[PDB]
Each structure stands twice: as structure tokens, then as C-alpha cells.
């Protein structure tokens, strides 16, 4: 159904936005994460993102509000496409090792170059050494 592990994984996504670990996501915290991924929302964009998910209207997102939104969403091409474009920041249609390292570091992941290459090899159906959109979706799917 909605499993204890799936909840746990959503809590992990919540923790990425809740940088100070205080239990709520603010507009400032959201802006931080989005900018760290090379995105650039406006004050107004960030506030409406908060407004959408903040069900009790106190101005911030707690984990039950985040879980509600995330479990609903789980029930998808456009989200996966946005995810791909976050990695593929030069828009050339291929995720390079450098692009992967870029996202990894901003996610708080810490993988060796050998692990980054392992990641690419596992996904790399056409053998070009980079991950195209097709291959990215396949790895995700």
C-alpha cells in the first residue's frame, strides 16, 4: 500500500528541503535547495510552492503535509523529465560524469569517481559513456 519504507524514503526527501532539521520547510529552505540544483525560482514562485502544500496555512510545510502531497503524486513523465533536466544542465541531452557529480554533491551524496562510472555503466545502454533520456528513464523505471 503506502509502506513504512516508502514513508521513510519520503522523509529523506523532506530532510533534503528541511536543511536545519527543525521539522518544517520554509520558503528560504526551498529556495536554497532549488538554487543548489541550478534552478532559479522567484519569491512568488517559492511562496506558491509552499502555499500548495501547506494545508494548515501556518506558512510552512511539516512532514504530514509533505507526505500528503508526495503520496498523492506517487499515484509521471513530466516529473522524471524535470529530474533529467536537473542533471543535464547544459541541455545537450546526455548526462555526463561531471553533471552527475554536480547533482550528487548538491544532494549531500558522496560517491567516488569509480562509483560515478559504475552508475553510468549500469545505465549506459548505447555505450557512449553518458546517460541519455531513454537510459535515465529505464534506470528509474
Amino acid at each position: 500500500q503506502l509502506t513504512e519504507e516508502q514513508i521513510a524514503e519520503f522523509k529523506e526527501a523532506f530532510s533534503l528541503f528541511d536543511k536545519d532539521g527543525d521539522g518544517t520547510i520554509t520558503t528560504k529552505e526551498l529556495g536554497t535547495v532549488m538554487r543548489s540544483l541550478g534552478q532559479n525560482p522567484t519569491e512568488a514562485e517559492l511562496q506558491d510552492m509552499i502555499n500548495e502544500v501547506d494545508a494548515d496555512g501556518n506558512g510552512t510545510i511539516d512532514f504530514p503535509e509533505f507526505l500528503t502531497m508526495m503520496a498523492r503524486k506517487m499515484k509521471s513523465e513530466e516529473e522524471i523529465r524535470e529530474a533529467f533536466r536537473v542533471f543535464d544542465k547544459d541541455g545537450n541531452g546526455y548526462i555526463s560524469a561531471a553533471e552527475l557529480r554536480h547533482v550528487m554533491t548538491n544532494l549531500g551524496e558522496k560517491l567516488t569517481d569509480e562509483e560515478v562510472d559504475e552508475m553510468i555503466r549500469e545505465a549506459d545502454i548505447d555505450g557512449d559513456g553518458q546517460v541519455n533520456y531513454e537510459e535515465f528513464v529505464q534506470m528509474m523505471t
Partner: peptide
């Protein structure tokens, strides 16, 4: 909302990494 899609996209980005790490641990890469 595509508004909520930005949150989910990040979960997906993190999911991309977590799936890999699990495979490498359990010897299923």
C-alpha cells in the same frame, strides 16, 4: 499541480542515487 512536480522531481533525483547504492550493496549492479 506541476507546482508540486518540482518537489517530486527532487525525490526522483534522490531515488536515482538510492536505487544504485542498494544494488551495489546487495551485489546486483
Amino acid at each position: 499541480e506541476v507546482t508540486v512536480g518540482k518537489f517530486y522531481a527532487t525525490f526522483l533525483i534522490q531515488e536515482y542515487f538510492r536505487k544504485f547504492k542498494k544494488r551495489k550493496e546487495q551485489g546486483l549492479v
